[PDB]
Amino acid sequence: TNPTAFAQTTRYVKDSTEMRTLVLNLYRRYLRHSRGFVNNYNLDIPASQVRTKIRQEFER
Amino acid sequence: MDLILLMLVAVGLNIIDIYIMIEILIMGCTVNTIYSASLDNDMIGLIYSLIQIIIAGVESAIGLSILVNYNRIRNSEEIE
Amino acid sequence: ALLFLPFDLEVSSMLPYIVSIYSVGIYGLIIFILFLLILIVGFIYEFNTKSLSITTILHKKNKALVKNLY
Amino acid sequence: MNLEILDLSILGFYSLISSNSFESIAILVATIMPVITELWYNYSQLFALLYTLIYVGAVVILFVFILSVINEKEEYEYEYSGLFILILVLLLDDLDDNESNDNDYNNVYITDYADWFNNYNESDLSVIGNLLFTEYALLLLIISFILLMSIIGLILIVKKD
Amino acid sequence: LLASGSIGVFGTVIVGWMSNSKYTVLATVRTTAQLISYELVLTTVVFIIALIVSSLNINVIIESQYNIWYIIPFFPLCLIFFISALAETARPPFDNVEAESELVSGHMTELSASPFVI
Amino acid sequence: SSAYDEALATIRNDLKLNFRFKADVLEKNVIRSILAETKNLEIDNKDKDLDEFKLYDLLSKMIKQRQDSAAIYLKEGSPDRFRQTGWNELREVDYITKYLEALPVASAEEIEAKVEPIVQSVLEEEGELKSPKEIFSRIPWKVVNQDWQASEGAVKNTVLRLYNLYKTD
Amino acid sequence: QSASTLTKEDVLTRSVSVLRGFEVKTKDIDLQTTFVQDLGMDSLDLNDALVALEEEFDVVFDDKTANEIKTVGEVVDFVLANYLPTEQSINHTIR
Amino acid sequence: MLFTSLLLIIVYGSLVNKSHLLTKLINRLGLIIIIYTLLIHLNINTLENLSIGINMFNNLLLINSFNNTIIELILIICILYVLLISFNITGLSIIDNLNYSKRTFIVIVLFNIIGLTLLPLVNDIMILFIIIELQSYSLYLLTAIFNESHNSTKSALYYFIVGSIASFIILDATVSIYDDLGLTNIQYILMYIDKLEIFDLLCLLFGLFIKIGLAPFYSYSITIYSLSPTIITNYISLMPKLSILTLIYIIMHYINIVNNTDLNYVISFLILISMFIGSFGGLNVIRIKTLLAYSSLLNVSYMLLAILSNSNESIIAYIYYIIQYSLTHINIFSIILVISIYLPIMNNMLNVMITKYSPIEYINQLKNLFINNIFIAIALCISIFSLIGIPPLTGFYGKYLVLISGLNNGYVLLSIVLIIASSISTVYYATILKVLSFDTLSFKDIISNNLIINTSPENNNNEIKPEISNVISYVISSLTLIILLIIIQYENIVKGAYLVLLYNWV
Amino acid sequence: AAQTKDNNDFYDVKTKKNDFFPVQVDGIESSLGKYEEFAKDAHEWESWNLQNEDHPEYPVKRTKIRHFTLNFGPQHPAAHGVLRLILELHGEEILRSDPHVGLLHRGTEKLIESKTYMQALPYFDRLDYV
Amino acid sequence: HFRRLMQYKKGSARPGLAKYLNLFSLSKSQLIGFPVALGAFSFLSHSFANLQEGQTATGEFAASSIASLIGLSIFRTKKPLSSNVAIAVGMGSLFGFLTWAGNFNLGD
Amino acid sequence: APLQQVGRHGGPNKCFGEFQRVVECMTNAKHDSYEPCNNLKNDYLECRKHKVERYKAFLMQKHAEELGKDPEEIGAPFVRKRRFLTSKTLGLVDGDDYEIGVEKI
Ligand SMILES: CCCCCCCCCCCCCCCCCC(=O)OC[C@H](COP(=O)(O)OCCN)OC(=O)CCCCCCCCCCCCCCCCC
Ligand SMILES: CCCCCCCCCCCCCCCCCC(=O)OC[C@H](COP(=O)(O)OCCN)OC(=O)CCCCCCCCCCCCCCCCC
């Protein structure tokens, strides 16, 4: 079998420095796909608002 | 209107639209052959018209295959 | 789909013979066979090349398990 | 009222404003239909039917290629044109429809006189086949040769193997 | 007869006119594939019958069968004509266009009321 | 500022034509880049009026910047895969020079036709030429806008070019 | 056609404008201008800027480069070396 | 023979398994087929019998001693071209395997040879249209034989579109003539040569001018020849011209009956422009095949002046010129294919990318050929000097015979312009020679182990290993010495061209 | 796995391995001058392109297009009830199948813990309900 | 010109069409200058031919250079005057040479 | 000699005889030049297009206008609708103005 699109293998990270990089990479992916989210889901807000919402969840 | 090449605006902006123009242009030759042959009561013109139709259909297929393979070349990664 | 056009024209080329079979006689009948015999080489060509198959993009091949023993 | 003039007026309007490739494959069908009907009603009903039998099969193959090559480009693009420039262009074009300048050949009507000598009376397709399969049999056999080349040509272009 | 029916094939594929319905689009591809299959066979079979009478008039073909019905000399062609007819009409076992279990309704999945009746 | 406003209208017009007729893409980058530097120029020179000479030094800096960048790339290679960055720099210099030569200012020959009598007259009265600083003194850097019709910098380039020709050491 | 038309002055100029629309300490941005010190961007602000600079130039920073970027000049270097025009349809080029 | 053997080869190629050796051996069978075709054609067709002009196949075809000579020339040049795909051009598999990877290569050539040989014989408008399609379709299929190549397919798309427009122009011209006269046979149409619109035949010539790359339609041929593989460009740039120009000569022979000087002026306008473009076009180019494309456009303009004058001196000029230019064309492309073995290998500025289809793509890839292979470099110099028109090479007599026919007919302007065009085009012909040789002394003592030829192994270190294969070397040697030493037999060869008649008789 | 320079979510720059020799070409010239003398104007000259599209390493930025993705969703006679089978097709050929279930997940296992053994028995009648 | 503007409006996002249209595009001063130069050429060629009871190479040299200079001063305004005269002398010489050689053929 | 101008029933059409007499004249060995066959060429071309005959009708119509002659008084009677080729127009003894049947023969 093959994994679905945009699938990552689960791994338990044991290094806080390596964990921090993985979080920052994922945060960039959320920002890049923000315009895609507005397109697919037909949102009534700009992609700029979507990126703001993403940052709030990462800031929590 | 013809001498200012108005036909260049009537042709669409895809490669396939050029193919359609060629078919229409050749079809104009066959209609002219049928018209003259019928007025003259001449079957040699109608034999010519039949030959034009078959031949014009051959180049339509040959040109299509070139365009088909041209599109395949672009979609060449085919990692699936 | 592309090869449909050459064969469609071949079928449409027999229409003159259908309504003139008697008049042309044996001469037209032999010419009619020659028309079909040249086109039968295209049929042999398509069979031998397997050009009328389905162009799949996946292929299932059975790998052999082997052991590089020491 | 010759209503074929109106049909070609609409077709010329839609050829100027056509944007995507589907509209072009419809301009082709919107062209063969006036040809087939006018051949049917004026000059040759045999070739009106031959056009339908051959061109339709070519049209569908043409249509199926549009599906495999449609590439999103012209749905979202913009065109400017202008309604006034379109209609003015079609008006100037409609002004001059005299393809020939022999006024007597275009104005004076003629007739033919029938005779009863042809007692063996058969269709035009039987005479066309009679000549094509006897006197111009070489033309037929070359056409068969060209059809064979297309069969080989299509395979050597498209087949990856 | 053959020319008129070929136009109906064109009218079927027009439903998937850059449509956003994937089942209509999937059905348009299958209509073309079936047309290529049956069109050559159905046309050639009728031409053999026309060749036996040396006429392209349907009434002459009927009246040519006074002493023999072409089912007896051309029993293989009657099967092939019927097989081609099933493929032309998209009737089972060749109902790959409107396959309910595959493409819900095929090219008709988006059609309702008058366009569906026609 | 009449000439400055007229000049910036042609640059804007060429932007409108470029979008209309889909002219060269690189030209679109040049005009868009000029307008941004013009936007910076307006902020830092308000109420002072904008003569074309101050615009002349703006386009002069753009021309000199890209020539320096082109020199490095045309010696050590462009970083892009198609190796076109170095030539792209020089292509933009041509576009900027097209507008530079359309301003109502003196050409290179007119400015040289006035400094060359000064460079020669310095050398004959003194014998040897060491630095251009002795030639800047005999230049009236107060009234070279309507008698010479040149900016402050275009005269500087003309002297530096002439000095390198005439220098004896 | 399928080649870059980018200059170092344009990429820097477009980079400065995109960085000017953010909340940075100073509007005076050059190649040597650092993100953490001169502009004052924390972890999240920096990646907002990188994605903003991605959209402007239609480029995508790799993960290794993005985590290790310090100065504005490094971005200009990256765009010049990696930018490619997007492929067009089979009809845009030949017609 | 051609038609019968083509059918066997078509079926046989699809039966046996696919391997490079089998395709190469099938190509050699194609070589035998053309040789037998030449022997059979020579055995039955003779110049003395065909002088009158003999009708065949219900007058659909008409062969005379002028048509017959071109047919034999086409068969001979096609023999030389098949040696390229039937033997080793370089001997290294990375380059030579391309010529053996397509099994339908030889089939398409045999398809096109039939179209090439029948086209000059056409005697009816219906068969003129059929044959010109048969020749054109095979050229498109040959241009696209390498369908895994992006440039090869792009060229075939351009070739198909332009060549279909020309064919429609050709068909539209014949339909207009049939509408005027109601006749299809050429000899019947000649009976009404004074009453049909003669410019309906200029439209027919215009479609033929597109297919030979004449200006202003030169753009597509220059583009196609440069993008196609060198093996493909060798064929498609020469073969269509042998047949179409011969057909143009026959059509212009009929046109001159009514002596319409307005038609002569339009053609002179196209020749004048083509000389200007052919000469000035090649001055600023870096690709060798783009340079040769302009050379082809220029030499076609020279031949069309002889075709336009259309007299007794024109038969000799055209016949001699077409023979010697075909040999020069074959010789140059043979050398270009061979000398890819001397290409340096990396181990970079401008990011120059070279593909397997066209290893020699730029003029400066011919650098130091005077050092790598002096005999081949001289052979290339002799061919280039022949294109220049340096006496007593074959190219000199070609220009001399063309000028005689042109000046005899009062074409003072075109004779002067071509001689100016020859001088202008000498600039880019000399640039090839400058690249080959001019840096010999400043580079003679250098260590070049980075060539493509150095990748080849050695057998025993006690044997002598020739660096170039036997067949391709002998062909280059033979053609170069023919070009060089034509003065020995020039008198006898030109006396033969005196006998080639096109309804001269008396 | 990881966003890289030549491969990311939105596009990739695919280059094949070079089958031919890495031929070196230096000193490009025309009959009127060297390449660098006209390279400024060579952008308009297609015959002056040094990069060949047939080369295996020719740079092409290709957008990552979603393959034809079909929802073989619950409203379908083939699916025996509620199955959102997500298929990525190449024409009609299946390339990847993603069966989405839980459209009939009713928490039977959770509810059973709240029932006695006798009360939980009818829940089993409704798992495989044929 | 107005036919090509329609082709512009029909498509401006296609670089291939735009590049080809820019080659054939004529400026405003060329749309006026070209008919004027050709009209002056025809007038002066016929006017001089009437003067000399026939066409001469000198008459064609004068007619072509003046017609060129008139057109050049219209659609080449932003070039030095001596540059336009240099082209006009070159253009006039070509047509004088064309007449001297007997046009396209000596004929009779 | 291939066949040309073949009628729809396989035999010679209206203009074949004109064409045949042109070929016989042009290929006869008794003719020094092609001048004798010039009138035969015009006759064949007149058989197809009737251009000179149409030109004569143009003159007669125009000359009748300038002398005030009525087109309906000097021309030939005609009917434009096939359904109204009635027995009264045809002149039958018991004629009528009712439409004739043209729907199905
Ligand atoms: C039984 C009748 C069937 C036809 C009835 C519908 C009438 C519509 C026009 C039919 C053909 C008339 C000429 C049109 C040629 C094709 C041009 C075209 O693009 O189609 C016109 C149609 C209207 O779209 P519209 O919104 O007006 O314009 C685009 C605005 N951005 O844009 C479309 O894409 C819709 C086209 C639907 C599919 C039509 C397929 C062609 C069928 C032609 C059969 C008849 C032949 C033509 C007879 C009339 C000739 C003018
Ligand atoms: C109505 C539309 C315009 C008419 C176009 C005519 C096309 C067919 C005429 C034959 C010329 C074929 C050459 C290819 C056609 C050129 C296409 C074209 O018109 O593009 C214009 C081209 C680009 O020039 P450019 O100014 O940079 O672009 C315009 C920027 N807005 O500028 C050019 O370079 C065009 C010149 C090409 C070279 C032709 C030279 C032929 C020889 C002329 C001189 C003859 C030599 C003998 C002279 C002695 C007799 C007097």
Ligand SMILES: CCCCCCCCCCCC(=O)OC[C@H](COP(=O)(O)OCC[N+](C)(C)C)OC(=O)CCCCCCCCCCC
């Ligand atoms: C010369 C005398 C001609 C005879 C005339 C009739 C020709 C018919 C040919 C059939 C061949 C065949 O059924 O072909 C089977 C093919 C492909 O099958 P395959 O993959 O090759 O497997 C079979 C090969 N075995 C068994 C050797 C391994 O597809 C089919 O299942 C087609 C099914 C058609 C059914 C249509 C229903 C029609 C009902 C008619 C009611 C009036």
